[PDB]
Amino acid sequence: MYAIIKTGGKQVKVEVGQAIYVEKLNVEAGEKVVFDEVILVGGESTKVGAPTVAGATVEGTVEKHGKQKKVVTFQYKPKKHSHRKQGHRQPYTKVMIEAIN
Amino acid sequence: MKLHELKPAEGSRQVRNRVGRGTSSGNGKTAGRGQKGQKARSGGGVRLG
Amino acid sequence: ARVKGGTVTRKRRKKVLKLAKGYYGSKHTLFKSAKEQVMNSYYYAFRDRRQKKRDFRKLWIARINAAARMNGLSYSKLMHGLKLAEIDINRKMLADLAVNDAAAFTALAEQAKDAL
Amino acid sequence: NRSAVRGGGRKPWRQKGTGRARQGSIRSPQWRGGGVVFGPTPRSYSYKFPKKVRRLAMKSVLSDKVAENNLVAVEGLSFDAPKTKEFKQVLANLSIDTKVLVVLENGNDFAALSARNLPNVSVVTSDNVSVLDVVSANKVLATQTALTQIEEVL
Amino acid sequence: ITSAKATAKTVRTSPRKARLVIDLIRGKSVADAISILKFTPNKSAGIIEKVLMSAVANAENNFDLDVESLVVSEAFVNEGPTMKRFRPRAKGSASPINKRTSHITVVVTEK
Amino acid sequence: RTTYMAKAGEVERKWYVVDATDVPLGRLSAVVASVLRGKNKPTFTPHVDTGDFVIVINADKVKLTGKKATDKIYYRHSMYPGGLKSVTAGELRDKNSRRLIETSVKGMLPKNTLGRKQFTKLNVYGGAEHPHAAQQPEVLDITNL
Amino acid sequence: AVPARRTSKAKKAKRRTHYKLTIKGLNACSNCGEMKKSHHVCPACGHYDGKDV
RNA sequence: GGUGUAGUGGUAGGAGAGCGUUCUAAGGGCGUUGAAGGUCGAUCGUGAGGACGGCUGGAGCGCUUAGAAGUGAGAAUGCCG
RNA sequence: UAUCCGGGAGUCAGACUGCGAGUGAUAAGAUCCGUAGUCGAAAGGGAAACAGCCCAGACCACCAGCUAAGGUCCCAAAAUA
RNA sequence: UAGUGAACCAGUACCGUGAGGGAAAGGUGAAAAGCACCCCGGAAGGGGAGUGAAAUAGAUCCUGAAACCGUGUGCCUACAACAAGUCAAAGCUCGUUAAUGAGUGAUGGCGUGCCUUUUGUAGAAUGAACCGGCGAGUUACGAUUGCAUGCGAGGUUAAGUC
Ligand SMILES: [K+]
Ligand SMILES: [K+]
Ligand SMILES: [K+]
Ligand SMILES: [K+]
Ligand SMILES: [K+]
Ligand SMILES: [K+]
Ligand SMILES: [Mg+2]
Ligand SMILES: [Mg+2]
Ligand SMILES: [Mg+2]
Ligand SMILES: [Mg+2]
Ligand SMILES: [Mg+2]
Ligand SMILES: [Mg+2]
Ligand SMILES: [Mg+2]
Ligand SMILES: [Mg+2]
Ligand SMILES: [Mg+2]
Ligand SMILES: [Mg+2]
Ligand SMILES: [Mg+2]
Ligand SMILES: [Mg+2]
Ligand SMILES: [Mg+2]
Ligand SMILES: [Mg+2]
Ligand SMILES: [Mg+2]
Ligand SMILES: [Mg+2]
Ligand SMILES: [Mg+2]
Ligand SMILES: [Mg+2]
Ligand SMILES: [Mg+2]
Ligand SMILES: [Mg+2]
Ligand SMILES: [Mg+2]
Ligand SMILES: [Mg+2]
Ligand SMILES: [Mg+2]
Ligand SMILES: [Mg+2]
Ligand SMILES: [Mg+2]
Ligand SMILES: [Mg+2]
Ligand SMILES: [Mg+2]
Ligand SMILES: [Mg+2]
Ligand SMILES: [Zn+2]
C-alpha cells in the first residue's frame, strides 16, 4: 500500500514505515499527527479522491523539528553601488508514518 | 552608580556618522556630496550668501 | 590611538575564498577574481532557485503528456478532464505515477475520459 | 602631517610623459613614509560643567552609599605611629573585606600613611574627596570630623 | 628507516631546468638514475648526481641499507632565494635579472 | 528529492521503423525527432538519452509539396572565400535522400552532445533495404501521429 | 608585440609538454656491464667493440 | 508578548538600528594541563560576523557595561615590498 | 495624504515609446515643447538576441497550484485542436 | 611600511658638477650549550650522532599568511566551442562541529566580469598583472537645530589663586 496526501501547500507520496519532511507543524516532538487530506490511496488496489478520499486519514508520529541549510540571498546590481545580503534557514518537521486507512 | 554598570539616559548620546566606509552605511562612496560639482570638492562650495 | 587591521581583512577574505572552492584556477586563489565570481554565483543561485521549479514542472508535464499519449489522450484534455472530475492531483505525483504505477495513471485517465 | 615631515618639494617626476601616476611629493599620505592625513593633535578633553550638577552628583553618591549601608563612621583613628597592620586590624574588626575609601581630617598623617600602602584602600583628606574615588570604592570609612568637614563645605 | 634523504640548498642553477632532469629519474632505480645523470649533457645532472650519491651513501652508513635494491621514491626541486641584479639597457633604463637558485632534494627508498 | 531520473544505460531502447512513401519530411522528421529524444516515454529526463532507434524507409519517395523540389535550396559554406555550395531538394532526394532526412532531423534536434548522439540513433535507407533485421524492430504509424 | 593577457598556469603547463628532454641510446657494455650510449666509447673502460682505447 | 489588516525593488539621498578593530576605567575569569596569531573543519546567527574542536605556536588575552578613536579598502595610470 | 514650522540633502547632461504641435524635406535612434508611461533607480516573463516596446513590481523558502502578455510540429512546455 | 628621514655605525649608502635630495635594513636560545665525532661531496650543502624543553629554534635564526613554484594522491578530462558559474544529476571515492553528509563530476537548462562615468557600458569608453601591507570628512575656535541632563523668568561663569 501507498498513499498521496496534501500537506504544506503541496503533496506527498508516502508509505508506512517511511519518514517524510514537511513544513512546520504546530505541534511538539514525539507527538501524534493525522492528515485528513489524502488525495489518493494505492498499491494492489487504487482509490482516488474528489478531491479527498471519503473520510480517510493518515497517521504519523513526529520525530524532530529542524532547520534546513542556510540559503544565502545576495541581491546585487552592477555599477549601482547597492547590494543586499540575507540568510535563511527554513524550518521543517520530520514525521514517520505509522498507519494508512 | 557602579563603574561596571554605567549607563546614560536614552537619547543623551548618539553614535557618530562615519563617512566613506561602505555603501550599506548610505554615507559611502560620495559622503553625501553627490556626484561631481563644486560642492563635491574639498574646501569646495561657495561663500555663505 | 592607532589601529592596524591585521586579522579583519584576512578573515573577511578567507570567508570568500572558502566560498570560492571548485572554481577554475585564479577564481579559487585570488580574492578579486573570486569575489567577482562569488557575487555572480549568488545571483545565478537566486535565479536558479526560481528556474528550478519551472524546470521540474516542464519535465513532469512532458512525462504526463507521454504517458497520456500511450493511453490515447493528451496532457491538456487529460488535465481538463481532471479539473472537471474535481481530481486535485499534483503533476509531481502524476508523473511519479506515470513512471511507476502506469495502472493508477490509467485509472486516472479513465476518470478523465469519462469526465469529458 | 604632510607639512612637518622631512622631505618633499621635488615633484619626483614630471606631470606627464611617464606611464607613472601623478605624484607631487615623496611625502604625501600614499607613500611608504608620508605625512598622516589628519591623525591626532595635542588636545584638551577636559570640560567643566555646572556647579549644581556637580554638587548633586556628590550628594547622590553619598546618599547611594547610605542607602546601601556602605558608610562606616569612627570616632578615632589616632595612631601613635603609622604601622599599617594596626589599620588592617581595624578594618578586620569593622568586618571590611572589600575596597574602601578612607576619608580623614586634614592632619591625620599617621593614619593616612598606615592606610596608604594597602591595595584595597584609597585615602583622601576631606577636601580632595571626589566622585570617582567614592564610586570606585564600595565602602566608605570616615571620621566624624571628616563628615562634619564635608557637611560644612557642602 | 626504509628511506633516506639528501638535499642541496642554495644551488646556483635554474629550477625549471633541473626539473627536466628530475623527471627522468623519478620512478627509477639508483643504477639507471646514475647512468642517466652521467650521460645527460645538461648542467643540473652533476648536482643531482652528487645529491643522489649522497643519499645512497647516507642509506649505507647512517641506516645500513642494501644499495642493490633502491628506488628513487621522491625527487623535486623547490625554488630558492634570488640574488637579483640589474642589466643596464638602452637609454638609461635598467632591466633586472633574477639569478635564481634551487633546493634540490632526492629521496631514495629500500624498494 | 523524489522524482525519477533515468539512470544512464538502464532504460531499454527499442527499434522503430518508419515508411515515408508520401509523407512530408518535416512532419516525418518531427515525429522522428520526438522519438529520438525519447519524449514518447515517461522516463524522459533531459540529460541521459532515454530515446529509441529509428529506421527510415523509401526516403527517395519522401513528399515535397509545392516548388520545394526545385526551390528549396540547401546552402552550405566551405569557410573558404566564395565557397558557397547550393543544392536543390529534388536532386538531393533523387541522389542522397539520406542527407535530406538527416539535415531535417539534425536541425530539428538540439545542438548538444546529447543531440549529436541522438542523431547517430537514426538510420536512413532509400528503399526497403532494412539491413537491421537482427534488432527486432517494430513498425510505427506516422499517419495517426 | 605585447601579450595583452597573462597566460594561465594551465596554458603554461600545456606548452611545457614537449619541452621535456629525452635521453636515449643507452645499452650495457658487453665488457664492464655498466651502461653506455650506443656507438660511443665506454668512458669507464674505454673499450669499443672489445678493443681498449 | 500575542491576533488581525496592510506593506517590505531601489540609485543620489535622508533617518534609525547595529557587527567588527585598537585603547582606557571598573568588574569579573583564562593561560606552559599551552594565550594571541597561523591553518583546516561538513558549525551558529537575518547581515555585518561569532563560537567550538584538530595541527602549528610559545606568552600574554578574553567576557559584561560605559567611554575615546590614526576604527573597517578592491580599484586612486595609487606608494613600498 | 495636504498644510505650517525647523534640520539635512541631492538634483539643474536626461533617453525612448504612444498621442498633440513647431523646426526639418509633415526625413532622422534628429531638435524643441506639452501630455502619459517606462528607463534612469526595476529585477522577472515575451518580443531570437534587445535600458527605453507588450505583461508584471524580486522580503525569504517550497521538486505546490491559477493566470497575464505571448504561445501550443521539433529545437522548446502546451492543440499536427 | 608605525614612531624622528635615521630603534640596526643615517644625514649613512646611493643620485647629483654643485646647492641639494636621500633610502633600505630590528627579534636564535633561559643560557652558545652554536652542532665534538662519522658518512656523501672539491667545497658549499646535506644525512646520522650529540647539546638543548624544543633544531620544521641552527645564522636566510620567534610566529611564519597570501601571491608564486613544486611533489603525490581520490574523481574527471583527447566530437568539443561557452565571463568559466549556477541549478538538476548518473557514476566513483571518503566519512563530519552527524546533519535532508563531504569531494569530484559525465550530461542537460539558464546565464555578456568588478569599478568609475554615463540618457544608456558585456562593453571595441576608463582603472586594476597578482598577493600582502599603507592609504581619504579629523581637530581647534565660533554659530545654529535636535536629543539628554541640571536649574528655572534666573541660567551661568571667563581669566586668575589653592
Ligand atoms: K549631504
Ligand atoms: K587595510
Ligand atoms: K517607477
Ligand atoms: K554547465
Ligand atoms: K546644542
Ligand atoms: K533644558
Ligand atoms: Mg563621540
Ligand atoms: Mg544612498
Ligand atoms: Mg566603491
Ligand atoms: Mg553632472
Ligand atoms: Mg567621483
Ligand atoms: Mg552637486
Ligand atoms: Mg550580473
Ligand atoms: Mg615642505
Ligand atoms: Mg614617519
Ligand atoms: Mg648611458
Ligand atoms: Mg524600500
Ligand atoms: Mg515588492
Ligand atoms: Mg592584541
Ligand atoms: Mg584609516
Ligand atoms: Mg593592492
Ligand atoms: Mg499606445
Ligand atoms: Mg534624441
Ligand atoms: Mg514625447
Ligand atoms: Mg545617473
Ligand atoms: Mg525588465
Ligand atoms: Mg544597465
Ligand atoms: Mg492552467
Ligand atoms: Mg513540446
Ligand atoms: Mg561531429
Ligand atoms: Mg569523449
Ligand atoms: Mg558564454
Ligand atoms: Mg575592460
Ligand atoms: Mg590597463
Ligand atoms: Zn665498458
Closest of A3, A95, A93, A8 to residue A42, by C-alpha: A3
Chain C, 2 to 21: residues with Cβ < 8 Å from chain A are: none
- Write down the H helix ranges in D72-153: 84-93, 109-116, 131-136, 144-153
- Cβ contacts of G21 on chain E, cutoff 8 Å: 20-21, 24, 42
C-alpha separations of B5 from B1, D135, D136, F74, G1 in Å: 7, 11, 12, 89, 71
Best probe of the C interface among A7, A37, A46, by most C CBs < 10 A, is A46
C-alpha separations of A8 from A11, A21, A50, B41, C22 in Å: 8, 10, 19, 58, 35
**CA–C1' gap, C35 and J128, in angstroms:** 15
Query: Is F18:F55 a contact under the CB 8 Å cutoff?
Result: yes
CA distance D69 to D49: 30
Torsion-angle region of residue G4: left (phi > 0), alpha (psi -120 to 50) or beta? left
CA distance C107 to D51: 94
User: What's the gap in Å between D56 CA and the centre of ligand 4?
Assistant: 74
Count Cβ–Cβ pairs < 8 Å, chain B vs chain D: 6
- E35 and chain G: CB distance < 8 Å anywhere? yes
C-alpha separations of B19 from A80, C2, D40 in Å: 18, 19, 18
- Cβ contacts of A81 on chain B, cutoff 8 Å: 23, 28-29
> Hey, are the CB atoms on G35 and E20 less than 8 Å from each other?
no
> Hey, are the CB atoms on B1 and D135 less than 8 Å from each other?
yes
For residue E30, the distance in angstroms to the closest alpha carbon of chain G comes to 13
Residue E103 CA neighbour count, 13 Å, CB half: 7
Query: Is A21:A68 a contact under the CB 8 Å cutoff?
Result: no
CA distance F96 to F77: 18
State the cell numbers at D33: 613614509
**Least CA distance to A41: which residue of chain C?**
C104
For residue C7, the distance in angstroms to the closest alpha carbon of chain A comes to 23
Chain C, 50 to 109: residues with Cβ < 8 Å from chain F are: 56, 59-60, 62-64, 66-67, 69-70, 92, 95-96, 98-100
User: What's the gap in Å between F128 CA and the centre of ligand 22?
Assistant: 60
What residue type is D67 in one-letter code? A
State the cell numbers at B44: 569646495
Asked if omega into A51 is within 30° of 0 (cis), the reply is yes
Chain F, 102 to 131: residues with Cβ < 8 Å from chain C are: none
User: What's the gap in Å between C33 CA and the centre of ligand 13?
Assistant: 14
Best probe of the E interface among G32, G35, G40, by most E CBs < 10 A, is G35
**CA–C1' gap, G8 and I48, in angstroms:** 35
- Cβ contacts of D135 on chain B, cutoff 8 Å: 1-3
Count Cβ–Cβ pairs < 8 Å, chain A vs chain C: 51
CA distance E35 to G34: 8
C-alpha separations of G1 from D52, F62, G5 in Å: 82, 58, 12
Query: Is A21:A33 a contact under the CB 8 Å cutoff?
Result: no
Secondary structure of A20-72 as H, E, C letters: EEECCCCCCCCCEEEECCCCEEECCCEEECCCCCCCCCEEEEEEEEEECCCEE
**Least CA distance to F42: which residue of chain C?**
C63
- Unique residue bearing C-alpha cell 580574492: C31
Work out if E26's Cβ lies within 7 angstroms of strand J.
yes
- E68 and chain G: CB distance < 8 Å anywhere? no
Cβ-based burial of E4 (10 A; exposed 0-12, middle 13-18, buried ≥19)? buried
State the cell numbers at E84: 637579483
Interacting residues of C34 by C-beta distance below 8 A, sequence separation 6+: C16, C17, C19, C20, C23, C26, C27, C28
Query: Is F11:C68 a contact under the CB 8 Å cutoff?
Result: no
- Cβ contacts of E38 on chain G, cutoff 8 Å: 43
- Unique residue bearing C-alpha cell 641499507: E65
Work out if C72's Cβ lies within 7 angstroms of strand I.
no
**Helix E15-25 and helix E30-38, axial crossing angle in degrees, nearest 10:** 140
CA distance E55 to F46: 59
- Write down the H helix ranges in E1-111: 15-25, 30-38, 44-61
Chain F, 37 to 66: residues with Cβ < 8 Å from chain C are: 39-46
- The count of other CB atoms within 10 Å of the CB of residue D52 is 8
For residue G35, the distance in angstroms to the closest alpha carbon of chain C comes to 44
CA distance A1 to G47: 90
**CA–C1' gap, E62 and J51, in angstroms:** 20
Q: Report the nucleotide nearest the CA of residue C12, measured to C1'.
A: H49
State the cell numbers at D116: 596608604
Report chain A's terminal Cα–Cα distance, integer Å. 10
> Hey, are the CB atoms on C26 and G8 less than 8 Å from each other?
yes
Nearest residue (Cα to C1') for I60?
A: A88
Residue list, annotated binding site of B for Mg(2+):
29
- Cβ contacts of B23 on chain A, cutoff 8 Å: 81-83
Nearest residue (Cα to C1') for J88?
A: C52
Q: What angle do CA G43, G47, G51 make, to 5 degrees?
A: 160
For residue C49, the distance in angstroms to the closest alpha carbon of chain F comes to 15
